[PDB]
């Protein structure tokens, strides 16, 4: 592993060169354990007290889990107050 | 405002509300007002034809000099014999069609309501020729996009038009003279200037 | 001769508890910064060190002076007093960006120098 | 019909005046889910309508919209399956094709006196040529063509007004505006709203056709000095006007920040007096019977934007003797003393 390098410029070099590679099997092994960690984490952290998607801040206002519950909320609750306003005018407010 | 040379007041017969005025009339041509109107329409048509000309020359010569298409030089471009048609037919067809165009433009200039009222049949299209303005006809036929629906409050658009068109006319005079004493294309003269600018100009032609 | 009546009330109080007014003299209007430099009154305060100012151009808010009853003979703000000082009590101007006007001028403008590091509010009369 | 769009344009004021047209529509056919495809600050008026269903935001006067947005809104109007368009956008082909791509039974628009309106008749069942090309400049009514065709005598009466501009507020906007002027020193029955302040703000709710519609501040200082204080609350269009008004007319003068026309009508409904210039607030004051005065810059413009001053018998109109919004500031104080008590 010892190589003495002769370069005229600065100094001599004592390069080691430990050529190595994670065994072919060990790459499958680290994939195996990481799929195990993914499995464990999916199960356990799905079984966790998820503090944002439980409260009346999210599930109360809208909160179906989509990305449009805000927009259908602010597009339907004004129609809800227009409906309530018409039903108010139906009894002469 | 800034009228084409400081130290000179603009003429009182033209100022402000006109497409790119800048007060350049030292030879008293727009002194009479109807003469100025006729000259405005003349300028707009001249500038638009000249803009189409500069595009059709610069684009063709970009294709030619670089070598994308084997198009002819602007100078020697009229004598191209087309297979399907002849120039002797094309002059007559141009006469007919551009007569129907320019005489309609004229009869609108002298009578704006014309070409759209009664017995002005153009394939039933007697509505796209409403005109709306002198020199700015509008309508679905002439501005399909309608970038400037309004035209009085479109001073930016008309100013861009007239400035680009004055510059295109000057560039067309450039194409006329530059390629009658040098006998090359504009792009050739440009790259002749952009190699040694201090050794290839007009006066470096001996 | 046309003599504008600057007052130039100093920022700190006297230890007795009354302000000390200096009543400077200089002729007309060229720059308020040049008047306060020439007639020996304290403009910059701690910025009176040599490289602690922009020497009159306005690129630093170091010559600021509260001016009261100064709507009579004064130039408007040159978009540098409007920009260097922004969220102020609006009676504060830069001496190297204000000017009290023309040489033919009489008036009783009173200027509180150094509006930074002061303790009095002047109880300004509400305009309009 | 059962489903009807509205592709109205302009902003607060033009879309406000369209409320008798919407009430006419729901009076014409019994159950109609009316929609609105308006510009921004047009949606904000449609708390005050109790009739309609969606009221989107589109800015129809954009004339080079986002093609994703343009295609999305064409497909949205196709997926809502309308029967009648009722544009009043005042455009022809290009926009008539926009109304034509909607699967609509009754394509209705307004059409230029100029040329950009040709080839539109092909794609519209009603033409409705308009005037001035500045459609808000026509005044209050603005839709007499559309009012007279919607509900022609075919079975019964047109019924073209139904006590025009019956806007209506809800309890939620009433409570939040009640808190907003209760932060000021106003009592829920006894105050006077203004909504006229010289500003550079799009919450001014003016018009498209009026230019010098908003009164100044030192002129307003003269007006507010000449008038006795019935707690005049001041309605600024933007927060930079607050310190400016407190500099001009005083610190004791109460300032209520309102940019929403629904909040503005809620502030009308608790007031007892209105000193509005030609904004939305005159029409909101005429709604729910509040005594207005209605300042203007012209007697003729005041007749175009109020043709019904003789009808309500409270909106005693005042305008400028010249143009340019410089009136007497004296007799308007006199009939402000007359009608507000
Ligand atoms: C505007 C316009 C201008 C500036 C020119 C300019 C020219 N044409 Mg011309 N043409 C124009 C309209 C038309 N040309 C032609 C058909 C022709 C032909 C058939 C020929 C020209 C030629 C010429 C040249 C005459 C010298 C010159 C380059 C001649 C040429 O190319 O010589 C160099 C020539 O043979 N033109 C038709 C049809 C036109 C419309
Ligand atoms: C007898 C002579 C007579 C002459 C010299 C003209 C000449 C003209 N007519 Mg014409 N007309 C004439 C008889 C008649 N015209 C018309 C109806 C029209 C219409 C509706 C229009 C013209 C137009 C024109 C002009 C443009 C045509 C063109 O350039 O060709 C183009 C030819 C082809 C492309 C083929 C031109 C001045 C046009 C114009 O005003 O400009 C135009 O719109 N004419 C009628 C029926 C009432 C005629 C009855 O005899
Ligand atoms: C009925 C047929 C009719 C046809 C074929 C044309 C065709 C033309 N007109 Mg037009 N016009 C026509 C009716 C009218 N024009 C005008 C007023 C104008 C103006 C003011 C201009 C044109 C120009 C043009 C050219 C550019 C067209 C374009 O924008 O794309 C082209 C030669 C432009 C032009 O000639 O410059 C190249 C130009 O400036 N037209 C009026 C009024 C019309 C009324 O009927
Ligand atoms: C119509 C074409 C045209 C022509 C022939 C001129 C000609 C001239 N201009 Mg003008 N100018 C024009 C259009 C034109 N201008 C336009 C459209 C603008 C923009 C508004 C200007 C803006 C302009 C400025 C700002 C100045 C000139 C100046 C000059 C002079 C340059 C001196 C000289 O002869 O150099 C060879 C010359 C008399 C200069 C001059 O001499 O000032 C008096 C000058 O300062 N011009
Ligand atoms: C032939 C094309 C043409 C025409 C008809 C016009 C017409 C007009 N121009 Mg424009 N102009 C043009 C080309 C043209 N222009 C070009 C190429 C430039 C840039 C150099 C300008 C720059 C320009 C300015 C800066 C101003 C005008 C203005 C005007 C108007 C008043 C002056 C007048 O009556 O002249 C009528 C002109 C003619 C009848 C053409 C005479 C041509 C001679 C005989 C040939 C000379 C050519 C030679 C190379 C020099 C008028 C509408 C004024 C304006 O817009 O305000 C109203 C103004 O202030 N012109
Ligand atoms: C104005 C104007 C005019 C009168 C012309 C005239 C001409 N063009 Mg040009 N052109 C123009 C604008 C104009 N062009 C513009 C604005 C563009 C872009 C082009 C791009 C263009 C191409 C790419 C070609 C022409 C060609 C031609 C010729 C034949 C056109 C035809 O109908 O066949 C003829 C000399 C053709 C040519 O040179 O003949 C082969 C050709 O190939 N033109
Ligand atoms: C680049 C210069 C230029 C500019 C700024 C304008 C600007 C305008 N034109 Mg003009 N026009 C031009 C060149 C120009 N035109 C040319 C070369 C022609 C001959 C074909 C015309 C023929 C023409 C007619 C016949 C009409 C207009 C109209 C208009 C208006 C609306 C359309 C628009 O803005 O398109 C701008 C387009 C571009 C910037 C794209 C340029 C692409 C390059 C290849 C506006 C004032 C209309 C109008 O004013 O009526 C209300 C009208 O009726 N123009
Ligand atoms: C804006 C238009 C424009 C532009 C960009 C050019 C640009 C050019 N021209 Mg052209 N030219 C023009 C108008 C223009 N010219 C006009 C109106 C004429 C008629 C007098 C000429 C006549 C002409 C000749 C005879 C020659 C050139 C040449 C040249 C090149 C060298 C510069 C020179 O000789 O100065 C000439 C400049 C002028 C005559 C001044 C014209 C007005 C200026 C451009 C307006 C200011 C903007 C250069 C690429 C030379 C060439 O081929 O280069 C290798 C050449 O031999 N030009
Ligand atoms: C059958 C054979 C004859 C056919 C053509 C007869 C056309 C009748 C004469 C029309 C000229 C009117 C001149 C007005 C009086 C006059 O002398 O004005 C000259 C004219 C400029 O006129 P102005 O705008 O300064 O005058 C406005 C006033 O004359 C308005 O009445 O310049 C022209 O010649 C324009 C081109 C003519 C029109 C082109 C149409 C050509 C038709 C052929 C198309 C192919
Ligand atoms: C229309 C025009 C050019 C049009 C060109 C076209 C169609 C070209 C077409 C082609 O090239 C192509 C595309 C392809 C090729 O294969 C074929 C052809 C056919 C060859 C030029 C106008 C060019 C017009 C010019 C140069 C006009 C200049 C006017 C000036 C300078 C006026 C000055 C004054 O009048 C004022 C302003 C005020 C007065 O008071 C004082 C004075 C001083 C009198
Ligand atoms: S000295 Fe720089 S601010 Fe006046």
């Amino acid at each position: 592993a010892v190589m003495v390098q002769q370069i005229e410029g600065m100094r001599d070099i004592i390069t080691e060169k430990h050529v190595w590679h994670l065994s072919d099997k060990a790459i499958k092994n680290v994939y195996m354990f990481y799929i195990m960690f993914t499995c464990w984490g999916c199960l356990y952290f799905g079984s966790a007290k998820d503090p944002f998607y439980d409260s009346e801040e999210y599930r109360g206002d809208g909160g179906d889990g989509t990305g449009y519950w805000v927009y259908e909320t602010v597009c339907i609750s004004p129609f809800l107050i227009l409906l309530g306003k018409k039903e108010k005018n139906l009894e002469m407010h | 405002r800034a009228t084409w040379l400081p130290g000179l007041n603009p003429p009182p017969y033209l100022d402000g509300n006109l497409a790119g005025d800048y007060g350049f009339d030292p030879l008293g041509l727009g002194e009479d007002p109807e003469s100025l109107k006729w000259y405005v329409q003349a300028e707009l048509v001249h500038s638009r034809f000249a803009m189409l000309g500069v595009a059709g020359i610069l684009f063709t010569d970009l294709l030619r000099t670089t070598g994308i298409r084997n198009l002819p030089v602007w100078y020697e471009a009229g004598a191209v014999k087309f297979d399907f048609a002849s120039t002797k037919t094309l002059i007559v067809v141009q006469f007919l069609l551009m007569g129907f165009a320019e005489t309609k433009r004229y009869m609108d200039f002298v009578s704006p309501g014309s070409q759209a009222k009664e017995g002005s049949f153009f394939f039933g299209l007697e509505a796209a020729l409403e005109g709306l303005e002198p020199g700015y006809p509008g309508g679905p036929l002439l501005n399909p996009l309608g970038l400037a629906k309004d035209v009085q409050n479109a001073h930016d658009w008309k100013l861009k038009e007239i400035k680009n068109g004055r510059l295109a006319m000057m560039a067309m005079l450039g194409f006329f003279v530059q390629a009658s004493v040098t006998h090359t294309g504009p792009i050739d003269n440009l790259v002749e200037h952009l190699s040694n600018p201090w050794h290839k100009t007009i006066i470096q032609t001996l | 001769p046309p003599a504008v009546d600057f007052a130039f009330v100093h920022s700190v109080l006297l230890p007795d508890g009354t302000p000390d007014v200096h009543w400077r003299r200089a002729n007309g209007g060229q720059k308020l910064r040049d008047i306060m430099l020439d007639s020996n009154i304290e403009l910059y305060g701690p910025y009176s060190k040599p490289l602690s100012n922009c020497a009159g151009v306005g690129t630093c808010a170091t010559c600021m002076v509260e001016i009261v009853n100064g709507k009579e003979l004064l130039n408007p703000r040159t978009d540098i007093e409007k920009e260097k000082l922004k969220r102020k009590p609006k009676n504060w101007r830069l001496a190297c960006q204000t000017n009290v006007g023309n040489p033919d001028s009489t008036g009783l403008v009173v200027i509180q120098q150094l509006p930074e590091w002061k303790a009095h509010e002047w109880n300004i009369p509400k305009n309009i | 019909v059962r489903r009807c769009c509205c592709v109205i344009s302009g902003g607060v004021y033009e879309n406000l005046l369209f409320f008798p047209t919407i009430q006419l529509i729901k009076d014409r056919y019994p159950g109609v889910q009316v929609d609105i495809l308006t510009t921004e600050r047009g949606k904000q008026t449609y708390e005050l309508n109790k009739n309609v269903r969606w009221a989107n935001v589109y800015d129809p006067d954009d004339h080079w919209p986002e093609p994703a947005e343009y295609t999305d809104m064409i497909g949205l109007l196709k997926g809502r399956y309308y029967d009648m368009v009722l544009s009043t956008k005042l455009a022809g082909l290009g926009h008539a094709a926009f109304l034509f791509m909607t699967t609509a039974r009754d394509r209705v628009s307004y059409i230029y006196p100029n040329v950009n309106s040709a080839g539109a008749g092909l794609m519209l069942s009603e033409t409705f040529t308009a005037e001035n090309t500045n459609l808000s400049e026509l005044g209050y009514s603005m839709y007499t063509q559309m009012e007279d065709w919607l509900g022609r005598p075919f079975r019964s009466v047109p019924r073209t007004p139904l006590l025009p501009l019956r806007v209506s507020i809800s309890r939620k906007v009433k409570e939040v505006v009640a808190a907003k002027y209760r932060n000021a020193g106003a009592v829920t029955g006894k105050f006077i709203v203004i909504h006229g302040i010289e500003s550079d703000s799009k919450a001014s709710m003016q018009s498209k056709g009026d230019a010098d519609s908003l009164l100044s501040l030192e002129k307003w200082a003269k007006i507010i000095k000449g008038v006795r204080g019935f707690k005049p609350v001041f309605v600024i269009p933007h927060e930079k006007e607050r310190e400016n008004v407190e500099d001009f007319v005083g610190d004791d003068t109460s300032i209520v920040f309102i940019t929403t026309p629904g909040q503005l009508a809620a502030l009308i409904n608790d007031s007892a007096g209105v000193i509005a210039t030609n904004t939305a607030a005159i029409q909101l004051a005429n709604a729910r019977d509040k005594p207005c005065i209605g300042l203007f810059s012209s007697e003729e413009k005041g007749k175009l934007f109020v043709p019904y001053a003789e009808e309500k018998s409270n909106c005693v109109i005042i305008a400028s003797k010249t143009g340019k919004l410089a009136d007497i500031d004296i007799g308007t104080v006199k009939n402000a003393m007359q009608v507000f008590e």
Side-chain angles (χ1 to χ4, degrees), chain B residues 74-92:
Chain B
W74 156 85
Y75 192 25
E76 318 206 319
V80 179
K81 278 91 179 184
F82 302 81
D83 167 70
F84 81 104
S86 165
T87 36
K88 317 190 96 177
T89 311
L90 287 165
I91 292 167
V92 162

Side-chain angles (χ1 to χ4, degrees), chain B residues 24-27 46 49-50 53 56-57 74 77 169-170 172-173 176:
Chain B
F24 176 62
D25 184 347
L27 280 54
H46 250 281
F49 265 109
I57 295 162
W74 156 85
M169 276 191 277
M170 197 47 48
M172 281 304 325
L173 190 61
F176 294 169

Side-chain angles (χ1 to χ4, degrees), chain B residues 34 38 95-96 99-100 103 106-107 109-110:
Chain B
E34 50 164 320
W38 174 256
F95 188 82
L96 267 59
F100 186 74
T103 182
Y106 179 66
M107 285 284 139
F109 167 73
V110 309

